[PDB]
Amino acid sequence: LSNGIEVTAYIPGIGHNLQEHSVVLIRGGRVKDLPGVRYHIVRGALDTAGVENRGQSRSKYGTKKP
């Protein structure tokens, strides 16, 4: 993070364009499935991309109106 924190985040959506040494925007919210993951990733606010072929819940996953 901006404070040098080792933070494990979760990637929502179907498919992603993420890799090492990439700028990501981390957002609040934990998932019970993974014992260590406590944060989510905003899709469409930074280097991270949106989700292709999304019609419903389009405000999240960062897809514009088709």
Partner RNA sequence: AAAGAGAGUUUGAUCCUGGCUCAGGACGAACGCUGGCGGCGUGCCUAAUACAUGCAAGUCGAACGAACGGAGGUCCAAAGUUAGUGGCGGACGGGUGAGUAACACGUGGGCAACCUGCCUGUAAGUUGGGGAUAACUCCGGGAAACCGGGGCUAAUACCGAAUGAUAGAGUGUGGCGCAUGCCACGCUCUUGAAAGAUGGUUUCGGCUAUCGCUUACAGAUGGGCCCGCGGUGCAUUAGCUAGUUGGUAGGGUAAUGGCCUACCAAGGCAACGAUGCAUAGCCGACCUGAGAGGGUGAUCGGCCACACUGGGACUGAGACACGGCCCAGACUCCUACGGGAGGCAGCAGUAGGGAAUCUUCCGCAAUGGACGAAAGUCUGACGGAGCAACGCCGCGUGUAUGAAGAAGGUUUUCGGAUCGUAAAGUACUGUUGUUAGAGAAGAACAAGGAUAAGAGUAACUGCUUGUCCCUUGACGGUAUCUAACCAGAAAGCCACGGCUAACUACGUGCCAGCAGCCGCGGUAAUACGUAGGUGGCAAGCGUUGUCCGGAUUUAUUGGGCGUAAAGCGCGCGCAGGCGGUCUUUUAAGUCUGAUGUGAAAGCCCCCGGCUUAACCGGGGAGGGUCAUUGGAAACUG
Residues lying near Mg ion in the complex (CB under 5 A) are found at: 57
Please state the closest distance from residue 20 (CB atom) to RNA, in A: 19
DSSP 33: S
Q: Are 24 and 17 in contact (CB under 8 A)?
A: no
Interstrand relation of 26-28 and 9-10 (parallel, antiparallel or unpaired): unpaired
Specify the amino acid at residue 31.
V
Please state the closest distance from residue 21 (CB atom) to RNA, in A: 16
Please state the closest distance from residue 58 (CB atom) to Mg ion, in A: 11
User: Given the rule CB under 7 A, which residues bind RNA?
Assistant: 1-2, 12-15, 25, 27-29, 31-33, 42, 44-45, 53-60, 62-65
